[PDB]
């Protein structure tokens, strides 16, 4: 269906000694393909998916200089925002940014986004039209004016609708063996007697890609939420994901309950019964 390319930055000041920790990660959909960590030995943008390793040294040089340049901007901004908020230099603080673009099934631009945060809260974000900014407070508003006087939004728009979409198409083509392949969830159900009268049924979805999935328990055809638990979707560690959902039921009544699995890799939804 649709695809996305996204970058996640995090900077964390370290008042005890030296400069901030800076970490960048790049994804295509739910696959990480590059990383930079200021604590790492390389000091390079590094590959994390086989299909990106084919890019030449030029690609690696540009991306490395640019992330490092960005890390330096974060260092500066950490200092400035400390000022905006009138905070002591003794405290560690955090800046985060996520940006990216979406394309549709035909590979056409769908939307772009770029929002950042300070200490885990919205700071400044690019509006959906990619022309103006949303400031969460008067600190961010100070940045907004400065950025509107310099038309920062235009460069972001030009990238999000242009450069970003083109590279996304390229990666999708080069890594099509994996990026354009779905792994449906491998499902099954387990049965844990809690007593002579009650049992917990757990519905498993394993080794699926991409991460988005819907797991639901039904009782006699109708959705149930009472006496259910639903863990957060988690990484298996091999590029795929896991999830489960469980329900407590009266013993002997297991056959009333069905688990329903929706996923892009499933042409028709799955329904499991014990």
């Amino acid at each position: 269906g649709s695809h996305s390319m996204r970058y996640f930055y995090t900077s964390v000041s370290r008042p005890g000694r030296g400069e901030p920790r800076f970490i960048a990660v790049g994804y295509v959909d739910d696959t990480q393909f590059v990383r930079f960590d200021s604590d790492a030995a390389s000091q390079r943008m590094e590959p994390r998916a086989p299909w990106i390793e084919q890019e030449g040294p030029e690609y690696w040089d540009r991306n490395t200089r640019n992330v490092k340049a960005q890390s330096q901007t974060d260092r500066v901004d950490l200092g400035t925002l400390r000022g905006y908020y009138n905070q002591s230099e003794a405290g560690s603080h955090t800046i985060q940014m996520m940006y990216g673009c979406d394309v549709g099934s035909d590979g056409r631009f769908l939307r772009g986004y770029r929002q950042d945060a300070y200490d885990g809260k919205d700071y400044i974000a690019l509006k959906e039209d990619l022309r103006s900014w949303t400031a969460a407070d008067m600190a961010a508003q100070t940045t907004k004016h400065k950025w509107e006087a310099a038309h920062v939004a235009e460069q972001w728009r030009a990238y999000l609708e242009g450069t970003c979409v083109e590279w996304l198409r390229r990666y999708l083509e080069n890594g099509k063996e994996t990026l354009q392949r779905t792994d449906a969830p491998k499902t099954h159900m387990t049965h844990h007697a809690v007593s002579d009268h009650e049992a917990t049924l757990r519905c498993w979805a394993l080794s699926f890609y991409p991460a988005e999935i819907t797991l639901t328990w039904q009782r006699d055809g109708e959705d149930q939420t009472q006496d259910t638990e639903l863990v957060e979707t988690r990484p298996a560690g091999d590029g795929t994901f896991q999830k489960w959902v469980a329900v407590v039921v009266p013993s002997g009544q297991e056959q009333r309950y069905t688990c329903h699995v929706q996923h892009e890799g499933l042409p028709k939804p799955l329904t499991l019964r014990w």
Binding site: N63, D77, T80
Partner: peptide, 9 residues
Amino acid sequence: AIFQSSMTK
């Protein structure tokens, strides 16, 4: 590929 500029806040 990453975004190339980096105006300060």
